[PDB]
Amino acid sequence: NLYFQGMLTEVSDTRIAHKKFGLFYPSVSRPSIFVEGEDRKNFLQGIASQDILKQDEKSLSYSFFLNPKARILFDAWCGNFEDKIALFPPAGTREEFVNHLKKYLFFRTKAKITDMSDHFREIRLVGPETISVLLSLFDNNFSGSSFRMLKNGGYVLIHPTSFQHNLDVGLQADLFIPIDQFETTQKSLEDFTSNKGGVLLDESSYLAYLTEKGIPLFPSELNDSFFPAEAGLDSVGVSYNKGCYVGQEPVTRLKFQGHLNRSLAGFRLEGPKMEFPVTLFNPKDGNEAGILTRTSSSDILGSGIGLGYIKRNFSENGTELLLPDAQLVRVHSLPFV
Ligand SMILES: [Cl-]
Ligand SMILES: [Cl-]
Ligand SMILES: [Cl-]
Ligand SMILES: [Cl-]
Numbered sequence: 001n002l003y004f005q006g007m008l009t010e011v012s013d014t015r016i017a018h019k020k021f022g023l024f025y026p027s028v029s030r031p032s033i034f035v036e037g038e039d040r041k042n043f044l045q046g047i048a049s050q051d052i053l054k055q056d057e058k059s060l061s062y063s064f065f066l067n068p069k070a071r072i073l074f075d076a077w078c079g080n081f082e083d084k085i086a087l088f089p090p091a092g093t094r095e096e097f098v099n100h101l102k103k104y105l106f107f108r109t110k111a112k113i114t115d116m117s118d119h120f121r122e123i124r125l126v127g128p129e130t131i132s133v134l135l136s137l138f139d140n141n142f143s144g145s146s147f148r149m150l151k152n153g154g155y156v157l158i159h160p161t162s163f164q165h166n167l168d169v170g171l172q173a174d175l176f177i178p179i180d181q182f183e184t185t186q187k188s189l190e191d192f193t194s195n196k197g198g199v200l201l202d203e204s205s206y207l208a209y210l211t212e213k214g215i216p217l218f219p220s221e222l223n224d225s226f227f228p229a230e231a232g233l234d235s236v237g238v239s240y241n242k243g244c245y246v247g248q249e250p251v252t253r254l255k256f257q258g259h260l261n262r263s264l265a266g267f268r269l270e271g272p273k274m275e276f277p278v279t280l281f282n283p284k285d286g287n288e289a290g291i292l293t294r295t296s297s298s299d300i301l302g303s304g305i306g307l308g309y310i311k312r313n314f315s316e317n318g319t320e321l322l323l324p325d326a327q328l329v330r331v332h333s334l335p336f337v
Contacts, residue, residue: 002328003270008297011208015300016199018170018337021127023193024206025186029122030077031094032155032176035085035101037111044078044085044111047104047246049228051239052078052085060147060157062237064228065089065100066247070254071224073100075237077157077174079147086147088157088174090218104246120154120176123185126209129198130158130171136192137185144171153178164232164264167335169213204296211296211305214266214334220276220294221264221307229254230309232264265310266332267292268303269323280321280329282314289314289321292329300337 016022035044045052050063057080065074074097077088089097094117101113125133134142138150145160159172177185193200201209216222216231228234228251238251254260280290288311295306310331314321319331 002268002303002330004268004301004303006271006302008271008299008302011205011297012299013199013201013205014209014212014298014337016197017127017201017205017209018212018300019128020196021125021129021133021198022201022206022209023133023189023198024124024126024201024203026091026122026124027203028091029117029120029176030088030091030174031097031115031117032120033087033089033094033098033101034114034116035087035111036083036114037109039110040083040085043105043109044087045242046244047101048076048078049238049245049247049251050078051242053242054239055080058146058148060145060159062160062233064233064237065097066228066245066251067224068246068250070227070247070250072218072222072226072228072231073224075218075222075233077147077159079155079157081147081149081155086155119179121179121182123175123177123189124206125171125173125175126201126206127171127198129196130173133189133192133196133198134158134173134175137188142173150177152181154181160236163236164214164216164334166235167214169215169335208296208298211294211307212298212300212335212337214307214336216264216307217294221309226309227251227254229260230262230264260312262290262309262311263315264334265290265308265315266334266336267295267306267308267321267329268301268332268336269295269306269327269329270303274323277308278323280308280310280323283320283322292323298336305332305336
């Protein structure tokens with residue numbers, strides 16, 4: 001008998017983002033890494049888990065960068081523009097990500113890497129009216145899984161609407177605005193928000209919104225302890241038809257012959273203290289059943305929610321597990337909202 005009847009006022013404004021749109025200004029944006037040169041495509045194709053060659057001109061693709069054992073080192077959004085490949089690795093990885101690419105940039109490979117991260121400020125949009133907000137600020141047209149250069153400079157990433165376990169997680173757009181145009185774009189967005197009833201999300205409400213959509217993130221759910229298929233992201237981040245790449249054989253073996261021991265799961269719990277990842281225990285025998293990787297409050301669900309990994313024998317919705325202090329968590333369907 002768990003209390004999932006609560007009022008969690010600190011994240012009540014995700015409701016507006018789910019119905020209209022939410023605006024978020026990250027403190028640390030994803031880096032903006034560009035790859036140029038005659039061998040840029042072959043170079044990146046051999047290290048990304050995604051098929052970069054097949055990708056069209058204004059398309060966006062998700063990829064992992066794996067180690068040789070197929071554990072996740074990074075994720076990135078990947079776009080093409082002119083004779084360049086644009087890569088957006090996770091926030092705070094600009095040096096480590098560039099070093100990882102240079103590890104595979106061998107003698108006489110015709111590719112060059114440039115870090116353009118200080119040229120842009122990131123603004124994020126979420127929710128059903130995201131395209132209408134873009135159409136107001138900018139000209140031409142927009143759709144899911146797209147990568148566009150803005151006429152003024154800068155870029156727009158519109159994520160695919162399907163993400164973990166091919167679930168529809170709604171619209172998400174990332175705007176990389178040239179520094180000198182930032183304060184103007186911000187003023188334009190504040191007017192649009194106030195007039196059209198969207199909401200300015202703070203970091204805790206932005207994270208609650210993403211957790212309500214079941215979205216796994218680097219470094220909590222996506223890191224070198226896990227495989228892309230464990231994370232529910234091999235359908236959007238891995239190609240099983242492409243040629244040689246780092247981690248390909250273990251990725252493929254897991255898929256066709258191996259057995260997935262654990263999988264990304266949603267959790268519901270009652271009502272900052274916990275040290276993540278937290279071990280989850282089976283109440284019957286006290287054995288390890290999974291791990292909880294992050295939590296948020298959800299006013300919509302009236303309880304805490306979280307993401308993590310569940311062993312196969314406990315994956316059914318409604319399965320009850322224990323935290324180390326014996327608070328109960330219940331496996332829940334994704335997305336939560
Ligand atoms: Cl590696
Ligand atoms: Cl270089
Ligand atoms: Cl899409
Ligand atoms: Cl586990």
